[PDB]
Design an enzyme around this catalytic site. Structure first.
Site, mmCIF file in Angstrom:
data_model
loop_
_atom_site.group_PDB
_atom_site.id
_atom_site.type_symbol
_atom_site.label_atom_id
_atom_site.label_comp_id
_atom_site.label_asym_id
_atom_site.label_seq_id
_atom_site.Cartn_x
_atom_site.Cartn_y
_atom_site.Cartn_z
ATOM 1 N N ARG A 173 -16.682 -36.868 -6.227
ATOM 2 C CA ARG A 173 -16.528 -36.861 -4.779
ATOM 3 C C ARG A 173 -17.220 -35.661 -4.125
ATOM 4 N NH1 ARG A 173 -12.770 -39.957 -6.947
ATOM 5 N NH2 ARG A 173 -12.805 -38.314 -8.553
ATOM 6 N N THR A 174 -16.768 -34.461 -4.467
ATOM 7 C CA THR A 174 -17.305 -33.238 -3.888
ATOM 8 C C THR A 174 -18.826 -33.107 -3.943
ATOM 9 O OG1 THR A 174 -15.232 -32.064 -4.418
ATOM 10 C CG2 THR A 174 -17.132 -30.709 -3.842
ATOM 11 N N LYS A 179 -30.004 -19.695 -22.228
ATOM 12 C CA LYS A 179 -30.618 -18.390 -22.475
ATOM 13 C C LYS A 179 -29.730 -17.152 -22.331
ATOM 14 C CE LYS A 179 -35.111 -20.355 -21.247
ATOM 15 N NZ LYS A 179 -36.475 -20.086 -20.702
ATOM 16 N N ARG A 226 -19.608 -24.988 -7.408
ATOM 17 C CA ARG A 226 -18.322 -25.267 -8.054
ATOM 18 C C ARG A 226 -18.438 -24.594 -9.425
ATOM 19 N NH1 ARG A 226 -14.977 -30.915 -8.491
ATOM 20 N NH2 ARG A 226 -14.216 -30.002 -6.527
ATOM 21 N N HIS A 283 -10.332 -24.273 -2.726
ATOM 22 C CA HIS A 283 -11.082 -25.517 -2.555
ATOM 23 C C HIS A 283 -11.146 -25.800 -1.053
ATOM 24 C CE1 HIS A 283 -12.081 -29.707 -4.415
ATOM 25 N NE2 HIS A 283 -13.077 -29.193 -3.714
HETATM 26 O O1 LIG Z 1 -9.478 -32.373 -9.560
HETATM 27 C C1 LIG Z 1 -8.475 -32.617 -8.859
HETATM 28 O O2 LIG Z 1 -7.510 -33.279 -9.286
HETATM 29 C C2 LIG Z 1 -8.423 -32.065 -7.439
HETATM 30 C C3 LIG Z 1 -9.810 -31.795 -6.879
HETATM 31 N N1 LIG Z 1 -10.572 -33.051 -6.950
HETATM 32 C C4 LIG Z 1 -11.839 -33.169 -6.551
HETATM 33 O O3 LIG Z 1 -12.484 -32.222 -6.104
HETATM 34 C C5 LIG Z 1 -12.499 -34.547 -6.680
HETATM 35 P P1 LIG Z 1 -14.192 -34.397 -7.369
HETATM 36 O O4 LIG Z 1 -14.035 -33.531 -8.627
HETATM 37 O O5 LIG Z 1 -14.501 -35.895 -7.664
HETATM 38 O O6 LIG Z 1 -15.277 -33.799 -6.423
HETATM 39 C C6 LIG Z 1 -10.403 -30.596 -7.654
HETATM 40 O O7 LIG Z 1 -9.908 -29.465 -7.457
HETATM 41 O O8 LIG Z 1 -11.330 -30.772 -8.470
HETATM 42 O O1 LIG Z 2 -37.773 -17.823 -20.966
HETATM 43 C C1 LIG Z 2 -38.311 -16.709 -20.806
HETATM 44 O O2 LIG Z 2 -37.779 -15.650 -21.194
HETATM 45 C C2 LIG Z 2 -39.677 -16.645 -20.132
HETATM 46 C C3 LIG Z 2 -39.932 -17.852 -19.244
HETATM 47 N N1 LIG Z 2 -38.840 -17.922 -18.261
HETATM 48 C C4 LIG Z 2 -38.744 -18.873 -17.332
HETATM 49 O O3 LIG Z 2 -39.560 -19.788 -17.232
HETATM 50 C C5 LIG Z 2 -37.550 -18.809 -16.371
HETATM 51 P P1 LIG Z 2 -36.799 -20.468 -16.153
HETATM 52 O O4 LIG Z 2 -36.575 -20.995 -17.578
HETATM 53 O O5 LIG Z 2 -35.488 -20.079 -15.407
HETATM 54 O O6 LIG Z 2 -37.614 -21.496 -15.311
HETATM 55 C C6 LIG Z 2 -40.099 -19.084 -20.163
HETATM 56 O O7 LIG Z 2 -41.131 -19.159 -20.866
HETATM 57 O O8 LIG Z 2 -39.209 -19.956 -20.212
#
Ligand SMILES: O=C(O)C[C@H](NC(=O)CP(=O)(O)O)C(=O)O
Ligand SMILES: O=C(O)C[C@H](NC(=O)CP(=O)(O)O)C(=O)O
Ligand SMILES: O=C(O)C[C@H](NC(=O)CP(=O)(O)O)C(=O)O
Ligand SMILES: [Zn+2]
Ligand SMILES: [Zn+2]
Lengths: 153, 310, 153, 310, 310
Positions: free
Chosen positions: D54-55, D84, D105, D134
């Site tokens: 949902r969220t 990594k 989240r 939330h």
């Molecule tokens: O998970 C619950 O039961 C309550 C609440 N529910 C939701 O957010 C629904 P969803 O995870 O589908 O976005 C939460 O805190 O995650």
């Molecule tokens: O991973 C590294 O350390 C160097 C280089 N880093 C990145 O590309 C950053 P990213 O994986 O967040 O896109 C890579 O070759 O993956």
């Protein structure tokens, strides 16, 4: 009969007075040997000067008496230090920490695969004056380490 | 009462040239004339918390050869220590109230030492404690060494492999250092080098030792070539570069070999000794294995029997 | 200026003097205040008598004056303590620890699932006198704890 | 600039009664007067390090309805924080140099608050941080409560289920406490009771609240029955006794209920609401879900638009 | 048609000095003069068969900034190549009949080159192929080096860390070798040293390069300190000794550094850079990250637009 230079009261009846502890040591000795977990009056003097013993350290535990066993164990941190036996204001005794043959319950074996870490037993190391430093040998795993890498509690 | 009666056998560092010579002499007498009921009515615990084929099986066969009975486990998985969170101390506490002697192999250094502290009057024989000691292996190595060289004094000994984790070489090196004129040659990769405490012990007693990068560099002047396995199960991840053997012994390498020189291996061997060596007159590891029976019978006879076997 | 009331007293020119430190707390502040670093003639008095108040611990550090926060953080481990600013063998300023609004860094959030543990950030709690115990709210997980529980970092 | 322009939406506890009212009013307008381009040229990062249907979906749908572009991940398993070892601080630091707003989240309480310290001018909207807050859920609940009751004052509200781990009820309660004369009924197992910090707050404001061991006790007095799911993924092994729903609502238990009472639930529901409740005029959880689109568009509109005139 | 129109961006080794300069110039323009519709009606496939945060997100963000549509997957676990056994050739063959360009990151070196043989007229942009090339990374680094130093000539550059598995430094070095008078300083563990093929190339061009065992040796001479992460996922078990960062940069080690030197890092950083370096005028890794948006928009603009006039 301490010394002179601006007064302040500081004398006790009976007890012990570890004297000439090197800098940054008085705290360690207080912790390791739990020489503070007591109801007795203690008066730690840190850095207070002493000639050749420039920046020495001092600890005075009232009513507390060490033992050839305990005193010697100090030879591992403050070897030169002198333990004075003060009974009734009078310095009735005066020893000096000599190297003991084994330290118990204090340190922890640096070898992680040592049985001593898992089971309910007290640690123990045979002390030895290797060459430059003091070597410590675990009673259990039988490995030895420079007295410097070994940790404690 | 013989010297080793009711004595714990934890580390060769605790024994003397005398205790060893006694064990070997007894080993030779028992090999000559077996004593089927010497240990009649005795019950021995065989407790292996780590893998084993020779040590446990030879040990247990020895107990039977002497008429004793055997109880125990070959894997800690089904012991209460393995499923109910029981400490080793309590295990050895209750066990020591059932049996006459305890033989144990354990994955952590000092385990055997720990047992003697809770075994009451029952003796503890260390079948291997982590990478620390392994006394009974050394006892059979010495037996085999003397059997093939005629002596244990003034020998040129080469130990190749994992010397850092080889509990066998730790014990053996300390044993031969109790005798005179033995010349040591250590051939191991840098990360698996012989521990300092052993080398210091060597210096003190003025024993001569030297490091060598290859087997061939000493093949001509060695009486005993003691090959070992890389202790794979004890290595740290940061040492996995040494998991494969750097020094492999092949038959061709035994050309400039002193006629009397034998090749030994506490076993098991992986790839450090090619199979061709097996049929060269120099290979002696399987003979060596067989001697574990006599060295282990000897050891048990002295610990559980008061009078020097008649 | 003058000479203290009880016997064994130590003198100094300028520096700080924490007094009324509860028993078994003196050696602790000595720890998590890193006072033992400063190589300035430090003086500790453990288990000293405290009239009708029983027993007190007492620290003295010359040429050292507590931080602009330590006194507030000192308000938690020992509320009934007093910090005397002594300049030229005289109390040129006396203070009493006051509970601050929030305390930063020194404390560790008891909630294990609080993000403050895994990530590289300084902790901080909002202090609030409740009914007898002090309530601490985590800046991050927003949970509120009893300082009793929190003082197990 | 509207009150919420560029503000971070982390905890309901940081929003005032007027801020809440502003989001509901706006939600009302967008629900009746769509703004297909209100956010044209904006790119929003939808970062869910924890499961969601949902969220996440309602949020991203709202972004498109308003003409924004969405970028992100629904599983941290393939981010570099997942494979990594990158910290959350660094993840937020770079992501914030790409996008205009961040919806997040996370499994640990406080993750959103932390993000605000590393996101620069980029606002962070808390879609859920562990069992803490939330915010946007509470906004859609308020919107839903208000459209069914025509008010957010003097309501008799009952919250049933896992109140300890329910970030939904944590935020919903702090919100309703910002209005006047609301009476709370808390029905939950002792182990999953409502945290004390929230109750101290209710008392502090002189708000009337009470505990009850059954739904039948309050059925004929509530205007809103808020059913929750037992937060299994957050339970402690020592609480595994409460995974099963203790209080289950069936169609029959609704006979003596106010004609205007609606049954709400953040969803998903496991077994706490029988599906036969679905066909009754009281069931409103799905309408409540749909309202998520309007509540969330409003928030996005107010945070990314300095001046809004609808 | 511009030089890069419809070209495949696989290895920096296939681009000339002028091609690189064209991307940087364009990046400069787009950074100051946005083109929200430059790619309206184009659909680009973002196919990452390996983890990523910066590269994927920055790339897809750039696509939206330019008005393109994105399609793809961040995990091959749910493609049919993952669950049905389909080859990469077939995956690229059909995908290329859907989209206008393909951005691809793969675990094995050469995956991108292979794709070009099956993609028809559809251009392929290499977002990373194992430990080989990382073209678009180098483009953003160049852009970042140039804006901080005002030049790509006569720079003193030091590359620290895992140079063997670092596709980032492989591409960055071949690029900087295309300019004049650049001096390279390579600080890395022997096991992770810079490949020989790249060094032979440096020599071939008479470029001055040298090795050093510490950062302190070169700190007062570098204009750019390029820190890298140890490529753990690519390490061989025999190299597990180098997982821990050997060379760690702390704020203190920056005291004798040129006032104009910037600390760069492709990211993520593990422990090779203390976070206290973050608050110093030298830290520029996050600015460098943000620049990824501009470098990558430029590339996309030049490859999908025959004529560009900004
Ligand atoms: O998970 C619950 O039961 C309550 C609440 N529910 C939701 O957010 C629904 P969803 O995870 O589908 O976005 C939460 O805190 O995650
Ligand atoms: O991973 C590294 O350390 C160097 C280089 N880093 C990145 O590309 C950053 P990213 O994986 O967040 O896109 C890579 O070759 O993956
Ligand atoms: O396994 C080795 O190589 C060394 C030593 N080997 C032995 O004792 C032979 P076994 O495992 O058959 O009892 C050991 O630790 O067990
Ligand atoms: Zn040990
Ligand atoms: Zn917290």
């Amino acid at each position: 009969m301490t010394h002179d230079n601006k007064l302040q009261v500081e004398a006790i009846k009976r007890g012990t007075v570890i004297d000439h502890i090197p800098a940054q040591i008085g705290f360690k000795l207080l912790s390791l040997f739990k020489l503070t977990e007591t109801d007795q009056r203690i008066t730690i003097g840190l850095n207070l000067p002493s000639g050749e013993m420039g920046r020495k350290d001092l600890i005075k535990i009232e009513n507390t008496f060490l033992s050839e066993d305990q005193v010697d164990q100090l030879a591992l941190y403050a070897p030169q230090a002198t333990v004075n036996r003060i009974d009734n204001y009078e310095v009735v005794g005066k020893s000096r920490p000599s190297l003991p043959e084994r330290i118990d319950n204090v340190l922890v074996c640096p070898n992680s695969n040592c049985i001593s870490h898992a089971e309910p037993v007290s640690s123990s190391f045979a002390v030895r004056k290797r060459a430059n430093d003091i070597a410590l040998k675990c009673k259990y795993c039988e490995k030895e380490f420079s007295h410097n890498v070994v940790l404690a509690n | 009462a013989n010297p080793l009666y009711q004595k714990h056998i934890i580390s060769i560092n605790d024994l003397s040239r005398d205790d060893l010579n006694l064990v070997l002499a007894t080993a030779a007498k028992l090999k000559a004339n077996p004593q089927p009921e010497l240990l009649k009515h005795k019950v021995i615990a065989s407790c292996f918390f780590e893998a084993s084929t020779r040590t446990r099986l030879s040990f247990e066969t020895s107990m039977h050869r002497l008429g004793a009975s055997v109880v125990g486990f070959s894997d800690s998985a089904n012991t209460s220590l393995g499923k109910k969170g029981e400490t080793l101390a309590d295990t050895i506490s209750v066990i020591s109230t059932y049996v006459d002697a305890i033989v144990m192999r354990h994955p952590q250094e000092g385990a055997a030492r720990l047992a003697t502290e809770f075994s009451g009057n029952v003796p503890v024989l260390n079948a291997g404690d982590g990478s620390n000691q392994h006394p009974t292996a050394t006892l059979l190595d010495l037996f085999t060494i003397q059997e093939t060289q005629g002596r244990l004094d003034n020998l040129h000994v080469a130990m190749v492999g994992d010397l850092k984790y080889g509990r066998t070489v730790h014990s053996l090196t300390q044993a031969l250092a109790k005798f005179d004129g033995n010349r040591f040659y250590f051939i191991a990769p840098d990360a698996l080098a012989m521990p300092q405490y052993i080398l210091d012990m060597l210096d003190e007693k003025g024993i001569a030792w030297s490091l060598h990068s290859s087997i061939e560099e000493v093949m001509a002047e060695v009486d005993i070539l003691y090959m070992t396995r890389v202790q794979k199960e004890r290595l740290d991840p940061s040492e996995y570069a040494n998991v494969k053997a750097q020094f492999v012994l092949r038959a061709s390498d035994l050309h400039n070999a002193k006629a009397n020189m034998k090749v030994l291996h506490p076993l098991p061997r992986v790839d450090e000794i090619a199979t061709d060596v097996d049929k060269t007159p120099h290979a002696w590891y399987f003979q060596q294995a067989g001697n574990g029976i006599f060295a282990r019978q000897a050891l048990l006879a002295l610990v559980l029997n008061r009078d020097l076997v008649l």
